[PDB]
DNA sequence: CCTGCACGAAGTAAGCATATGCTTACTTCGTGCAGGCAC
DNA sequence: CTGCACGAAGTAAGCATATGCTTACTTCGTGCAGGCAT
């Protein structure tokens, strides 16, 4: 059952004979793709062509065999089934080469293959062994393989001669040499028909198989022995070994280039390197040594095991790596006594989680290997059974306290269930398997018997319990009703309006249930409103819907408007689809007044009053001074950027200066109206919280607690505000009862920062730097947050680049594709020939738009 | 601050406050309603029509209003803001009820709602404040309300008398009572407008609001003590009463209809009751006692938490959840001294989790809340940090220890990650939280650093570093560095062939990643594969192309014959169209035989003999005889259902029976030719295994070892065949060391029935029924199952029902659309219309096609 | 007061990515005639 | 011995479902002028 060869020789040797076998190899996938065309297609088989071709490669296959080996010294202790060829090559007369004398036998070429690390996933199978359609005499053919007849052996059909043949007699006819007369009535069969199988010399004779050939030495009697006599005694002729050596390998090639030919003349496409060697693997999956090979590349790949503890491994166990992985340590050490405990442990994931996770001794988890099988099997087994393996001294205590432990794991990892819970529930339902079975057949009322299983409990282990039983009026009965009944909290949500309603569910909880309190605002009833979320996905969904889809299947154009969020003055000044576009593309009313002219916004259907509500209040104060004029107060806005306060600032002198026609008189008076203004903004914001109000604005955002533990740990609440609002995080941290959730809850954005990966520090950092999160994300920019000491990923995180760089792009460019562009979902649509202008690759422009 | 009432009446009396209440608040929503179309639409602020309704809305809350508490004896510790007001209306003269005293102040209505038990989810907003449209004096509305003056509160606008609003003084002035000098200078500016605001009121007479407003009783000074004097002075009419209460519920319905009418008029679209309540909803919650509504019932929900103790954590903590979860048990008891700790476990997940899965004290747990927030908390805290804290004694060894065992629980429930392994990697890295973060960035090098970290502990913590080390040639620095460039082992297999090439990855190592050895089969190159993969799926998606799709951007139709699996004979036969429609529709080359006609196969295009080989091999054994007759075989075999050994079965003249021309020469010649074919049968198939055979087989199918623990078992491998063929599942598990891993390789089939969740006897009972599982999924009905005792969830597992049943279906319809539709991809594709035919509901169809 | 409306934040929950349970050709395996071509 | 067609299913690749992890994706909280209006 075992294939193995060592090699011995040098490198050179090594490479010479790595090559030699492919070649041969190549030249076997040759004969097996030419009996594929012959008999695939029924014109093929009778096709002359194809027939020269599969003797050809016949020919070259035993030429590249007898080049293996060539020293008969670079191979050692070969071994093929069982049978070690070393001894039975030794004790022959003309001794020779074990390699090729295991060749010459069926699938002898597995343990070259293995001394020469070939891939054997690739079946790399050379056999020698053709005898209806060889055109040598076979048992020749194969004496001259074993014995490396290289000289011998022709290198195309035309090249045969007919003394090796047809007149295959007139080859003894040069050497005589002693005949047998058994051997006298194997030959006179052979001179009928030279292509004779051996099997029918033998039954037409009345001998055996094994005395017609007998031993392939001249010291023996048969057909081999005679071929061996004659061989043995013919010259080694070395011009002709040399000229068939650099011939055959381009006559490989040639005879590759007419297969093809034939093959895409009687199939219409050629036979690829790949598609030969997966038919090598169908045609030799008829015997499990293939299986064995696989397994043994399998263990070797996913678990790093040595080639010979692999290959060993696979054959005791059937090539099963679902068995050896449920086999204890000591049987591994049995049939494979070389294999190491690490192997064993990397194979057999319980042995290793037994020794390691566990402190167990190789015995210790050889105990529940066999009393189990596996982790899953001790998951499986009931609690009871092991506790009376171990009270009757058939376990010992290291293994039973370590499978208790096993059991108690998957049942305390859930939030609620503590070690005497989990025990109870071991003892009320035997083994952690059917507390899993029972959990996800919501047998709700059977768990809560058992004492100490909570509502945590249950919510922790039943999936959806928690999102049921959470709403007011669904009890227990009720949600295991419901969870029995649609098989699940998806099937309950995603049912109908009607059945829920059959079911006693209130509209309340049946909103609550499917989240259809923000789309029961808009539509007035639940159904519409499921029907909209599933259609649609999202409430935001909808929002985003064009204005002429939301007006088919819709109620009302207000209801539109009301949807989208529009302001009152945008949507009485213009449109439904004119001030959704510019609500949607400018955000603020107070943008479309910024940003867009005053004729810009009459054009579009506005009313004179209704396009001065649109611009600004500051258009509204100007033009109320005595009409400054619609055209000459917007320039008198855009000149200090719609700001009241920059109007005041700047001498009236200064003011006639920079915007054009101005009269001073008039210049006087809108600085005299602003410095009048910023005068009446002062009453509203005169306060500044006292020390009540602090202390009362610190019990409302830490709670009672943590404000006076604050107030006590500094000066007064007035210091623990001025802490605040320069966002000292660090100096808030050092109070011991303060944390993350409480800071956070004082230092607007804190969160956001946190959960973006950074350190307090770097947050404090970054608020101090920007002031709030919005201006980082707006305003920051890559370097300057690498200036604060973050890293590339907490910069992309942060910013919201995210998308963009997990499609393979560095911060930098995504940040460009920000500043030169808008938002990520823009550069999405972009152009495919303006990302490649800006200097993008297409395959980062595949990825940008995948 | 607390907002409570206490109810004390009857049921009767609950019930016709709950009324009052509730039809108050649809008359304040109805204000609420007008008060939002006044401003929504610019042209229906104008309309005097919908002033009319707003006005007759505020008198119909008002009206309401009076009838709350009408004995003044069923509400009793009334709470507004701390405000005991109980004790307050005790100190008037007058007395009066503490209820109306109560919902003239702003949000008083929160106590009086929560004595009645309303629903506090749809806002149920009482106030009776109106000042600027209010058609009657405001003051004087106030003092009728809270007085309980239900009769002289008007129910239309056009009721309302001109002495109780225009005109306010003409009312004061029929009664004479005693005005002081501050009352006089209060009325010499009500002469002027009657509307004016009382902070007007004040800003105008130098006083604050509270000397002007002065206490709602005769005994004080001020607007409401001077109404107070003059309406107590008034007599209680009845009749005005009862008619008033008769007709405002018609009359608020004719107010709602006149709200819809303008709705419709000015928006196109009605207000629905549930629109209004979200608007309520909307415009109510920017106040934080609307946030401690909702907090306070999501605690009552989700927590089970009682009423009031639930409201007073929500006030002590501004309604949020989040910032209770973190607050020890403690604090909680110092806001709430009536709160239980089963409530704090309830509320505070992680108080819950230290207490009961960890067995600390309440201190001891509010030790770690405190220091640490949360168990995330202590998950993200270094390992050192804990270990200072606890050497200063700022850490119980309680809180210590279960610090530690929280912070090795998060990596020992991973495999391979023992205890000291676990501590070597929370000292090199410090908290759990960042070893996740380690693994999520692949930094597989800086983990493989730390001692015990092996293969089994990367590929266990490190996402997708599991797939890409077991691939041959892909080492620890390849996978490393793959997963660092693609960014996961997704984006390692959607990334194309050629960067992958580019990485230094052999095609090898390519196919296997991408699992395109199935598609490497059919193509000769990789590319072509990964494009099929990527538009088309899988090789299965590209098996059941058509064969015109196929065929276009196809290469042969001999690959495509290849890829479907189409035999020689079928292929060679016909066209590529029929023959691989015949396939696809028969399966079997034998089925084709079977179910089709000689005649009709050569119809198609075959060969009289291909025809025959297409046929059955019966077909071809009768016909080499005395020519049975290429017509008549086929009724021969019609009789015996093409089986050759019912045919030696029966008398030659039972023969001449079923057939209609036959010879009974012929008749005992062909059965005769049939017992001739059951003894080459049998020659060839009378193997059963001997003892030898059977302990090779048991060594192949469980090993050596598990073999000879069953032969010493029992008696012998004969024995242990015996119990494989008859599928003796439980004899087989009793044997100590054999398992389900090798029953289930002894026993073909085991395996699958015990994943569809079947006990080795059900699944053993199944086997010894029916032999195989094949023949359970095409034989076997659901009766027949539930005969075996099988419930109906394994029925549906195990015949491959659980799509069907999964939309809600009961496994019996299910099979039946199995039986009458063929497959159960074929029940998603039937016309909507049969299936209303059979019986089946709209929704049923709907989520049978979904 | 009343609340639209404009903005920032993470509250919250919707996607995205990963892990887990399960169904069945998605793939390996066993057998049987048929005789093409061997012990 | 190979061919090669067929059925079966401890076998394993997809498929479906549940869960963890980020963000803004979606609700929520707050503050500011001015009309609903103390
Ligand atoms: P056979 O393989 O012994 O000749
Ligand atoms: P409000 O009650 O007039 O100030
Ligand atoms: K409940
Ligand atoms: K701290
Ligand atoms: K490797
Ligand atoms: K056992």
């Known amino acids: 059952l075992v294939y193995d060869a060592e090699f011995v020789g040098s490198e050179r040797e090594f490479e010479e004979e790595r090559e030699t076998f492919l070649k041969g190899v190549k030249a076997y996938d040759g004969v097996l793709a030419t009996r594929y065309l012959m008999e695939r297609s029924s014109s093929a088989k009778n096709d002359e062509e194809l027939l020269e071709l599969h003797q050809n490669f016949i020919l070259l296959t035993g030429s590249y065999a007898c080049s293996i080996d060539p020293t008969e010294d670079r191979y050692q202790n070969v071994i093929v089934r069982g049978v070690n060829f070393d001894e039975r090559v030794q004790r022959l007369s003309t001794?020779?080469?074990?390699?090729?004398?295991?060749?010459?036998?069926?699938?002898?070429?597995?343990?070259?293959?293995?001394?020469?690390?070939?891939?054997?996933?690739?079946?790399?199978?050379?056999?020698?062994?053709?005898?209806?359609?060889?055109?040598?005499?076979?048992?020749?053919?194969?004496?001259?393989?074993?014995?490396?007849?290289?000289?011998?052996?022709?290198?195309?059909?035309?090249?045969?001669?007919?003394?090796?043949?047809?007149?295959?007699?007139?080859?003894?006819?040069?050497?005589?040499?002693?005949?047998?007369?058994?051997?006298?009535?194997?030959?006179?069969?052979?001179?009928?028909?030279?292509?004779?199988?051996?099997?029918?010399?033998?039954?037409?004779?009345?001998?055996?198989?094994?005395?017609?050939?007998?031993?392939?030495?001249?010291?023996?009697?048969?057909?081999?022995?005679?071929?061996?006599?004659?061989?043995?005694?013919?010259?080694?002729?070395?011009?002709?070994?040399?000229?068939?050596?650099?011939?055959?390998?381009?006559?490989?090639?040639?005879?590759?280039?007419?297969?093809?030919?034939?093959?895409?003349?009687?199939?219409?496409?050629?036979?690829?390197?790949?598609?030969?060697?997966?038919?090598?693997?169908?045609?030799?999956?008829?015997?499990?040594?293939?299986?064995?090979?696989?397994?043994?590349?399998?263990?070797?790949?996913?678990?790093?095991?040595?080639?010979?503890?692999?290959?060993?491994?696979?054959?005791?166990?059937?090539?099963?790596?679902?068995?050896?992985?449920?086999?204890?340590?000591?049987?591994?050490?049995?049939?494979?006594?070389?294999?190491?405990?690490?192997?064993?442990?990397?194979?057999?994931?319980?042995?290793?989680?037994?020794?390691?996770?566990?402190?167990?001794?190789?015995?210790?988890?050889?105990?529940?290997?066999?009393?189990?099988?596996?982790?899953?099997?001790?998951?499986?087994?009931?609690?009871?059974?092991?506790?009376?393996?171990?009270?009757?001294?058939?376990?010992?205590?290291?293994?039973?306290?370590?499978?208790?432990?096993?059991?108690?794991?998957?049942?305390?990892?859930?939030?609620?269930?503590?070690?005497?819970?989990?025990?109870?529930?071991?003892?009320?339902?035997?083994?952690?398997?059917?507390?899993?079975?029972?959990?996800?057949?919501?047998?709700?009322?059977?768990?809560?018997?058992?004492?100490?299983?909570?509502?945590?409990?249950?919510?922790?282990?039943?999936?959806?319990?928690?999102?049921?039983?959470?709403?007011?009026?669904?009890?227990?009965?009720?949600?295991?009703?419901?969870?029995?009944?649609?098989?699940?909290?998806?099937?309950?949500?995603?049912?109908?309006?009607?059945?829920?309603?059959?079911?006693?569910?209130?509209?309340?909880?049946?909103?609550?249930?499917?989240?259809?309190?923000?789309?029961?605002?808009?539509?007035?009833?639940?159904?519409?409103?499921?029907?909209?979320?599933?259609?649609?996905?999202?409430?935001?969904?909808?929002?985003?819907?064009?204005?002429?889809?939301?007006?088919?299947?819709?109620?009302?154009?207000?209801?539109?408007?009301?949807?989208?969020?529009?302001?009152?003055?945008?949507?009485?000044?213009?449109?439904?689809?004119?001030?959704?576009?510019?609500?949607?593309?400018?955000?603020?009313?107070?943008?479309?007044?910024?940003?867009?002219?005053?004729?810009?916004?009459l054009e579009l259907g506005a009313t004179p009053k209704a396009a001065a509500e649109i611009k600004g209040p500051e258009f509204k104060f100007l033009l109320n001074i005595e009409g400054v004029g619609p055209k000459l107060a917007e320039r008198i806005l855009e000149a200090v950027d719609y700001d009241l306060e920059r109007l005041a600032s700047l001498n009236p002198e200064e003011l006639a200066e920079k915007v054009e026609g101005l009269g001073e008189e008039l210049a006087e008076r809108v600085v005299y109206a602003a410095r009048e203004r910023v005068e009446s903004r002062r009453k509203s914001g005169r306060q500044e919280r006292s020390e009540e109000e602090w202390k009362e604005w610190l019990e409302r955002k830490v709670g009672e607690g943590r404000a006076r533990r604050l107030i006590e740990y500094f000066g007064s609440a007035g210091e623990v505000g001025k802490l605040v609002e320069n966002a000292e995080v660090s100096k808030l941290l050092e109070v011991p009862g303060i944390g993350d959730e409480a800071v956070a809850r004082l230092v607007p954005g804190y969160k956001t920062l946190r959960d973006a990966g950074l350190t307090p520090a770097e947050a404090e950092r970054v608020l101090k730097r920007y002031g709030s999160v919005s201006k980082v994300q707006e305003g920051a920019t890559p370097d300057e947050l690498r200036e604060l000491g973050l890293g590339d990923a907490k910069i992309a995180r942060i910013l919201g680049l995210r998308s963009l760089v997990n499609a393979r792009l560095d911060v930098d460019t995504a940040y460009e594709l920000a500043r030169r562009y808008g938002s990520v979902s823009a550069v999405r649509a972009a152009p495919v020939a303006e990302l490649r202008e800006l200097g993008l690759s297409d395959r980062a422009i595949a990825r940008i738009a995948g």
């Open 95 to 601: 001794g020779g080469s074990p390699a090729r004398y295991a060749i010459v036998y069926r699938r002898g070429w597995r343990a070259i293959a293995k001394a020469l690390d070939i891939d054997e996933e690739d079946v790399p199978a050379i056999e020698v062994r053709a005898v209806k359609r060889n055109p040598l005499q076979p048992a020749l053919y194969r004496i001259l393989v074993r014995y490396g007849r290289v000289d011998l052996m022709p290198v195309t059909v035309d090249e045969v001669p007919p003394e090796m043949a047809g007149e295959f007699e007139r080859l003894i006819e040069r050497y005589d040499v002693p005949i047998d007369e058994k051997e006298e009535r194997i030959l006179e069969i052979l001179r009928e028909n030279p292509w004779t199988p051996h099997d029918e010399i033998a039954r037409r004779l009345g001998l055996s198989v094994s005395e017609v050939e007998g031993e392939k030495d001249p010291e023996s009697s048969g057909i081999y022995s005679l071929w061996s006599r004659v061989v043995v005694n013919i010259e080694y002729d070395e011009r002709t070994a040399k000229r068939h050596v650099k011939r055959r390998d381009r006559l490989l090639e040639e005879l590759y280039e007419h297969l093809e030919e034939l093959s895409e003349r009687y199939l219409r496409h050629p036979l690829t390197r790949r598609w030969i060697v997966e038919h090598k693997r169908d045609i030799m999956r008829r015997y499990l040594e293939q299986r064995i090979v696989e397994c043994a590349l399998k263990l070797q790949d996913r678990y790093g095991i040595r080639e010979d503890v692999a290959l060993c491994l696979a054959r005791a166990f059937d090539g099963s790596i679902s068995m050896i992985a449920t086999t204890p340590y000591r049987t591994l050490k049995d049939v494979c006594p070389d294999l190491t405990l690490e192997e064993a442990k990397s194979v057999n994931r319980t042995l290793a989680t037994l020794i390691d996770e566990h402190g167990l001794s190789p015995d210790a988890a050889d105990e529940l290997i066999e009393h189990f099988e596996s982790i899953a099997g001790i998951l499986a087994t009931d609690l009871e059974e092991i506790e009376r393996m171990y009270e009757e001294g058939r376990l010992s205590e290291e293994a039973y306290r370590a499978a208790v432990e096993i059991q108690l794991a998957e049942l305390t990892k859930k939030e609620g269930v503590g070690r005497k819970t989990a025990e109870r529930l071991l003892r009320a339902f035997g083994n952690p398997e059917r507390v899993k079975q029972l959990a996800r057949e919501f047998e709700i009322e059977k768990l809560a018997s058992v004492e100490g299983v909570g509502e945590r409990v249950l919510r922790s282990l039943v999936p959806g319990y928690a999102s049921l039983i959470s709403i007011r009026g669904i009890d227990r009965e009720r949600a295991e009703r419901l969870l029995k009944k649609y098989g699940g909290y998806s099937k309950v949500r995603e049912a109908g309006v009607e059945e829920l309603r059959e079911d006693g569910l209130t509209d309340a909880q049946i909103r609550e249930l499917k989240g259809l309190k923000t789309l029961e605002s808009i539509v007035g009833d639940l159904e519409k409103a499921d029907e909209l979320k599933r259609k649609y996905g999202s409430a935001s969904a909808v929002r985003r819907l064009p204005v002429e889809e939301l007006r088919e299947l819709g109620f009302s154009d207000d209801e539109i408007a009301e949807i989208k969020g529009i302001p009152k003055k945008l949507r009485e000044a213009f449109d439904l689809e004119t001030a959704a576009e510019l609500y949607e593309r400018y955000g603020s009313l107070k943008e479309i007044g910024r940003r867009l002219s005053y004729d810009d916004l």
